[PDB]
Design a protein around this ligand. Structure first.
Ligand SMILES: Cn1nncc1-c1nc2ccc(CN3CCC[C@H]3c3ccncc3)cc2[nH]1
Length: 103
């Protein structure tokens, strides 16, 4: 697929983005009070990398659903003016802008 090639490009650029630091690894619920209760379906860039490395994305749309889940969870748990919330808004707009550039 050139479908999955563009997801490799997008994921690589997100992994290396300055604002990616809250989303590189699963949130550790032992360290973030209330996260387990509030967030029903956690997602992060390393989980997406692993799923991509296995070929577990059958389409670019499944990839995008995981990316959007990262940012939906971020806005659910974090206030828009919190440090993590501000990073999540940067990353979300970056993903949207880059996604439109390929589709
Ligand atoms: C609240 N939250 N909601 N989405 C993402 C986040 C979030 N990611 C972080 C990434 C690094 C961090 C920074 N630290 C704080 C202690 C350990 C580390 C950490 C690692 C894994 N999980 C939580 C904390 C907070 C972080 N807080």
């Amino acid at each position: 697929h050139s479908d999955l090639t563009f997801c490799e490009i997008i994921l690589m650029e997100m992994e290396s983005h300055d604002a990616a630091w809250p989303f590189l690894e699963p949130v550790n619920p032992r360290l973030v009070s209330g996260y387990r209760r509030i967030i029903k379906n956690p997602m992060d860039f390393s989980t997406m990398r692993h799923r991509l490395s296995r070929g577990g994305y059958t389409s670019s749309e499944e990839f995008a659903a995981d990316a959007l889940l990262v940012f939906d969870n971020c806005q659910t748990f974090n206030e828009d003016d919190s440090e993590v919330g501000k990073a999540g808004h940067i990353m979300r707009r970056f993903f949207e802008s880059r996604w439109e550039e390929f589709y």
